Design brief:
By secondary structure, the chain is an alpha+beta fold. It has 13 helices and 19 strands. InterPro entries: ALO_C, FAD-bd_PCMH, FAD-bd_PCMH-like_sf, FAD-bd_PCMH_sub2, FAD_lactone_oxidase-like, Oxid_FAD_bind_N.
């Protein structure tokens, strides 16, 4: 039934060997949990393995691969509801949903993530400030718990506490077998985008707190983290909203829902070029153009700093560029309101993802960053993390004790466990 397998997160680091059950048979899954529950080092569900960290592996224990469980059960355009197996991925879901005029309500940077993964990490996207994160759009889920019973959870009424502990719970309340998502109605597969380019960090912040952000449903930015000030924190901002059919050019209006370095570069002329090409209004783009503006030895690092703490945010960015650690691929966004999940990552404030080449001193440098992020009231994302301490984590997520208490009810015997749970002491 199982197979000894060497697993790593997307970051290809911190490997552990587990026994991996891969089956499309939901009853065999129920029975494997029932088995582990009788006996140990517990079990954890795994999706497409896109989380960079250690949350979907379980050294010396059981790992259940959920991807073969990928049935879309129904889609209903009138209710906007979608009933799907947890192994369904968001790209699969997106293609199936389109002909109904339905848009996946939250999309992350890659569509190769399972619904179970999207819920357990409570994922966010370019529309977080207008739409929240993934958990906000789940109307029901079926959770396989430690007792081998399947519980039907909904965001309100009874069992809401377990529901909201599961969202962002990193698989640690049990296995999401199935869920109902409420989709976003759309009449097209396209975006209308405005683009803006700023010349400094001070400007980037300025553009994000002037009010204009309320005019867009989607917003994010490419961020210079390498240049010394003033150029530090300059950005290319891409903001927009889903087009309606009347906004499409003629050629595209018959099929509105279908998805299908020189010598000048670092000089004044390319400064003008980049500025010009990054500044546009009412441009219609497909998903790949708008949302997908696109390995081994890198360290992903993502944090959010509370909105008010803006001077502290500027401080952290300053620390980053003068560190001698250079990140070229940086994504910035202002998050909106948070949800009620205790371990949910997003909070209203300044969010950034960076990507550091693995190098001498980087490990000790990120620990120091951790300290700064913590002190500044912010947190890091478990999906992007493999090396922070339990002490740092628990301070970053003050409702962790609230969460752990919920987990102890539903898993007294510690049937569900992962590398991350042990490292972060969520066990
Ligand atoms: C290139 C890239 C870009 C990304 N961009 C973003 C982004 O913009 N925003 C964002 O929020 N994230 C982003 N991520 C992270 C990704 O969205 C999350 O890590 C997501 O959880 C990955 O889903 P997965 O199916 O691969 O799950 P895995 O990585 O396999 O698992 C992640 C967690 O979900 C749990 N889980 C999986 N299935 C189940 C289940 N059926 N029941 C219970 N628990 C389950 C696992 O136990 C594990 O704890 C990105 C990742 C990559 C590689």
């Amino acid at each position: 039934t199982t197979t000894a397998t060497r697993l790593t997160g997307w970051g290809r680091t911190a490997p552990s060997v587990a026994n991996v059950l891969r089956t499309p048979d939901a009853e065999m899954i129920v029975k494997a949990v029932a088995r582990v529950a009788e006996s140990g080092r517990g079990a954890i569900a795994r999706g497409l393995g896109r989380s960079y960290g250690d949350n979907a592996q379980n050294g010396g224990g059981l790992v259940i691969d959920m991807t073969p469980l990928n049935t879309i059960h129904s889609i209903d355009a009138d209710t906007k509801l979608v009933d799907i197996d947890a192994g369904v991925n968001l790209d699969q879901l997106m293609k199936a949903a389109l002909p109904f005029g339905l848009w996946v309500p939250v999309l992350p940077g890659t569509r190769q993530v399972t619904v179970g993964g999207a819920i357990a990490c409570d994922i966010h996207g370019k529309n977080h400030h207008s739409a929240g994160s993934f958990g906000n759009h789940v109307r029901s889920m079926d959770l396989l718990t430690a007792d081998g019973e399947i519980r039907h959870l909904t965001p309100t009424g009874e069992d809401a506490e377990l529901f909201w502990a599961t969202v962002g719970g990193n698989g640690l309340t049990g296995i999401i077998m199935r869920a109902t998502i409420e989709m976003t109605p759309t009449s097209t597969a396209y975006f209308i985008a405005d683009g803006d380019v700023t010349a400094s960090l001070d400007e980037t912040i300025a553009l994000h707190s002037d009010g204009s952000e309320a005019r867009y449903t989607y917003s994010s930015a490419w961020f210079d983290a390498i240049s010394a000030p003033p150029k530090l924190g300059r950005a290319a901002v891409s903001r927009g909203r889903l087009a309606t059919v009347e906004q499409l050019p003629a050629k595209l209006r018959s099929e509105p829902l279908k998805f299908d370095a020189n010598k000048y570069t670092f000089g004044p002329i390319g400064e003008l070029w980049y500025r010009k090409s990054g500044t546009y209004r009412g441009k219609v783009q497909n998903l790949t153009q708008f949302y997908h503006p696109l390995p081994a030895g890198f360290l992903q690092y993502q944090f959010v700093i509370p909105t008010e703490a803006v001077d502290e945010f500027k401080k952290i960015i300053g620390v980053i560029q003068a560190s001698g650690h250079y990140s070229f691929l940086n994504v910035f966004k202002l998050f909106g309101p948070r949800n009620q999940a205790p371990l949910s990552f997003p909070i209203p404030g300044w969010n950034i993802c960076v990507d550091f080449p693995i190098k001498d001193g980087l490990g000790k440098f990120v620990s120091e960053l951790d300290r700064r992020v913590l002190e500044f009231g912010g947190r890091l994302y478990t999906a992007k993390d493999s090396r922070t301490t339990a002490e740092t984590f628990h301070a970053m997520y003050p409702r962790v004790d609230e969460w752990i208490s919920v987990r102890r009810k539903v898993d007294p015997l510690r049937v569900f466990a992962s590398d991350m749970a042990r490292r972060l002491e969520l066990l």
